[PDB]
Each structure stands twice: as structure tokens, then as C-alpha cells.
């Protein structure tokens with residue numbers, strides 16, 4: 001009689017948590033599959049992550065599931081020591097991956113600058129705005145100003161040259177999965193805080209270790225623990241929510257009474273649902289604006305075995321492209337992240353060739369694939385990233401929804417928010433605990 005909307009990681013881990021506490025639940029999932037924005041799918045000859053890919057043991061929630069479902073030693077590092085290429089002022093520069101990492105390390109020093117003052121506990125991201133805050137008033141003022149500054153402007157204002165600016169532009173096109181110039185720099189500062197304020201650790205956590213058996217080894221693991229069947233192909237159309245109960249209506253018109261609703265539908269898809277009473281205005285403002293997640297992820301297959309890394313600034317079709325798999329038919333599969341889903345067809349060989357042509361003339365695309373999450377009505381976004389102002393007046397507003405309507409999902413997590421499965425596992429579990437505590 002707790003209704004969980006969505007069978008992504010947040011909904012699945014919430015259901016398992018309620019099951020432990022002996023609370024009845026049902027998961028309603030719009031699609032014919034579980035996993036949500038994590039999706040391991042056979043494409044181009046091997047299982048590919050169409051959404052979530054990388055993990056690390058410094059991600060508490062993800063790592064606990066990894067060792068729980070038998071994947072402790074089933075991780076492999078992405079290719080390193082690639083030949084690096086970056087576009088600066090319309091020109092392609094060649095260098096080593098070490099050259100590029102060294103430039104990004106210098107830029108991150110400035111990008112992280114106030115993280116030690118803001119985030120002594122990196123899992124208390126709004127401590128500076130708390131009544132417990134005991135630092136100088138100027139730290140609070142800089143904190144609020146940093147929510148209105150993008151991460152590239154920090155590097156420009158520090159006097160870095162155009163080559164570094166173009167590299168950081170490319171880097172945050174990928175990191176903010178859209179337009180980095182509309183983003184909040186506090187997101188980047190918290191990533192630093194969660195990564196011991198070191199670029200190499202941040203990259204080790206977010207872009208290095210892949211699951212050999214895919215994200216599906218974790219979400220199928222959680223689903224396999226559930227004693228209540230998930231209702232697939234059952235989109236929720238309406239949520240009524242009050243002080244002591246709730247009512248969910250599906251698109252087919254079926255009405256389901258509930259003691260509480262845990263809604264894991266992302267902001268990009270919340271407009272599909274009618275809420276009664278209406279969601280708070282501050283929450284509605286975030287839904288209208290959306291997150292700063294408008295980009296896309298591609299998998300490109302080229303002829304030959306090539307150790308390749310490419311960076312290119314906005315408005316490139318793809319801003320970061322890296323070799324990931326070397327296939328037996330003498331081809332390489334590369335992964336790419338781009339800032340604008342509408343400027344690339346992830347399944348067009350000509351478009352993928354244009355991506356590769358950003359850096360090389362000689363490499364030939366023979367296949368390409370991807371899922372455009374932004375054009376997917378049940379997602380409407382890639383991973384959640386913050387526009388200006390959304391660090392302090394965005395993700396945290398979804399907590400109180402007065403009633404028995406709780407929002408859970410990676411996009412509302414305290415820690416690795418939006419960008420990581422860790423945040424979905426965090427917030428699905430803690431939201432289930434809110435429901436557990438209320439009932440106890």
C-alpha cells in the first residue's frame with residue numbers, strides 16, 4: 001500500500017527497503033523494462049550501457065550493491081594512455097592524455113576553490129545556509145554568488161589561456177550534459193568535495209571503472225530480491241496526495257489507493273502526471289525550467305583499433321569522445337558525450353562520422369548507436385545537472401511535498417546527485433526510510 005512510481009534504481013531500492021520493514025508496496029513502471037536511465041542493451045555486437053556506465057568504491061551506495069550482487073571483482077578500467085586531440089580556436093591540437101589531464105588538473109584547482117569552506121562534510125551540501133553554519137558571512141555570500149556563476153567563467157576569471165578555456169568548455173559540456181554556460185558552478189565544487197578535491201580522483205570515481213556485467217547486474221539483482229511483482233507497462237497519470245493517504249490513477253484509468261506514494265519520475269517527465277493538490281510553486285518552477293540536462297551519449301564504431309581521446313567545445317556535436325572497446329572484427333567502439341541532443345542523431349553513421357571528423361580525417365565510422373533520453377517521454381533528460389540557482393533553490397525543494405507524496409531519485413540526492421547511480425540508490429533508500437519512520 002505504498003505505491004512506488006518507476007522501476008529505476010531509486011524505485012527498486014526503495015521497494016527493497018520497504019520489504020525489509022514488512023511494508024506492502026507495489027512498483028508501477030511505464031515501460032516494458034526496468035532500470036530506467038540505467039540500461040544495459042546488446043548493440044553493435046556487445047552489451048553497451050545506453051545510460052549509466054561507471055562506478056567506484058568511493059560511492060557508498062553503488063559499491064554496497066556491487067559487492068552485494070557479486071560484482072566485487074567484475075569491474076574493468078576504461079582504456080587510458082590514448083592519443084589525445086582537442087579543438088581550441090577552430091584548430092585541432094594533438095598531445096598525450098597526460099598533457100590534457102595536466103591542463104585540466106590546473107583548471108580544477110581554481111574550479112574547486114571554496115569547496116573546503118563550503119563542504120567540510122560533502123554530504124551536507126547546504127550546510128553554509130544552515131543555522132549550524134559557523135563560518136564568516138563572506139563565505140555564505142560567495143556560496144550564493146557561486147550558484148549564479150558557471151564553471152567556465154571561474155577559469156576565465158583566473159586568467160587561463162584560450163586553450164585551457166576550450167578544454168574546460170568541452171569537459172563541462174560533458175559533465176553538465178548540456179550547455180555548461182547556463183550551469184551552476186556549485187555542482188562542480190561539490191563534485192570536487194566528494195572527490196578529495198583532486199581532479200584525478202574525480203575522474204577515477206566518475207569515468208574509469210565499468211561493470212563487466214553491466215548496470216543490469218545490479219538492477220536485476222535488486223528486482224530479483226523483491227517479493228512483489230513489478231507492474232510494467234503501467235504509466236501513472238495522476239497522483240492525489242493528502243495527510244494520511246494517497247490515490248494513484250494509471251493511464252488506463254485504474255485507481256489504486258495508497259498510504260504513501262514514492263515518485264521517482266524525473267523532472268523531465270513530471271509534466272506527464274497530474275498532481276492534486278498542485279506541487280509547491282518553487283517545485284513547479286524547477287519542473288518548468290528543467291534541469292540543465294539536454295545533452296546525449298553516443299557509441300561510435302570505427303574501423304581499426306585506435307586509442308583515441310577527443311575534446312571539443314560548445315557547440316560541437318560531441319565534446320568528449322574516448323575509446324572504450326577493441327572488438328574482434330578489427331573495430332573500436334568509442335563513447336561520446338555532447339551538450340545538445342537535438343544537434344546529433346545518435347544512430348546516423350553520417351552524424352557519427354561528423355563527430356570523428358572534428359579531430360581526424362582518416363578514421364571511418366562503420367556503426368553508431370544511442371538512446372536519446374531527452375526525447376524519451378519517460379525521462380525527458382539525461383542525468384540531472386544544475387542550472388544557475390538550482391544548487392540552493394532547486395534539488396532540495398523536492399523534500400517537503402507536504403503530504404504523503406515523497407520524491408526520490410538521483411536528482412534529489414545529497415551526494416552524487418543526478419550524475420550517478422549512487423545518488424539514486426542513496427535517495428531511494430532514505431526516502432523509503434522517511435516513509436518507514438512516518439508509519440512507525
Ligand SMILES: Cc1cc2nc3c(=O)[nH]c(=O)nc-3n(C[C@H](O)[C@H](O)[C@H](O)COP(=O)(O)OP(=O)(O)OC[C@H]3O[C@@H](n4cnc5c(N)ncnc54)[C@H](O)[C@@H]3O)c2cc1C
Pocket residue numbers: 005006007008009010011028029030031034035036037038050051052053054055206234235236237264265266269272273296297373377378379381382383408409410411418419420421422423424
Ligand atoms: C546517458 C546517461 C549516462 C549515465 N552514466 C552514468 C555512469 O556512468 N555512472 C553512474 O553512476 N550514473 C550514470 N548515469 C546516471 C544514472 O543513470 C541515474 O542517476 C539513475 O539511473 C537515475 O535513477 P532514478 O531511479 O533516479 O531515475 P530513473 O532511472 O529515471 O527511473 C525513473 C523510472 O520512472 C519511470 N517512469 C517515468 N514516468 C513514469 C510514469 N508516469 N509512470 C510510471 N513510471 C514512470 C521511467 O521509465 C523509469 O524507469 C547516467 C545517466 C544517463 C542519462
Ligand SMILES: [NH3+]C[C@H](O)c1ccc(O)c(O)c1
Pocket residue numbers: 053171172174175206207297320337419
Ligand atoms: N556519463 C557521462 C559522465 O557522467 C561524464 C562524462 C564526461 C565528464 O567530463 C564527466 O565529468 C562525467
